[PDB]
Design a protein that fits this description.
part of a larger assembly; 2 chains; mainly beta; two-stranded antiparallel ribbon; 1 helix; 9% helix; rod-shaped; viral protein; Bacteriophage; T5; Probable central straight fiber
């Protein structure tokens, strides 16, 4: 989790003072969270105890991250 | 084939016959039976009877004999 600081600067203040960060206006403190990578937590095959015939075997894979694609 | 056979059936002694339609389900089964139907073979209405092959000692329910 990072805290970011916004700012603007003009030619009035040089690179030096920019490094010092005095006279340059600064933003209020806001911290943002980094969404974790897609994490796998459990992989397992399972179905009902097959009596006869062909039955569908399911695949149970468990993930615990965060994404959209 | 919906038809089974008893190869040596007792003679003159009746019998109660039931046929069961056993099913089978994924977890278990269940059976529905037909109504009882008793029958006995006698000297009335046999068929497909072409097994009378003389052998010289003809043992029969009506007589036991030996012929040449």
């Amino acid at each position: 989790t990072y805290e970011v600081q916004g700012a603007f600067y003009d030619s009035i203040i040089d690179s030096e003072l920019l490094n010092a960060q005095i006279g340059i206006n600064l933003s209020d403190k806001q911290t943002f969270k980094m969404k974790s990578a897609p994490r796998i937590t459990g992989a397992r095959c399972e179905s009902e105890p097959v009596d006869v015939g062909v039955g569908a075997p399911i695949v149970y894979i468990d993930t615990t991250g965060e994404a959209d694609y | 084939a919906q038809s089974a056979t008893i190869i040596s059936f007792p003679w003159k002694v009746e019998h109660k016959f039931k046929v069961s339609s056993i099913a089978w389900g994924p977890d278990a089964q269940d059976v529905t039976d037909s109504a009882v139907q008793t029958f006995i073979l006698n000297e009335s209405t046999p068929l497909d009877n072409s097994f009378v092959n003389e052998t010289g000692i003809e043992v029969n329910y009506a007589y036991i004999k030996g012929k040449i």
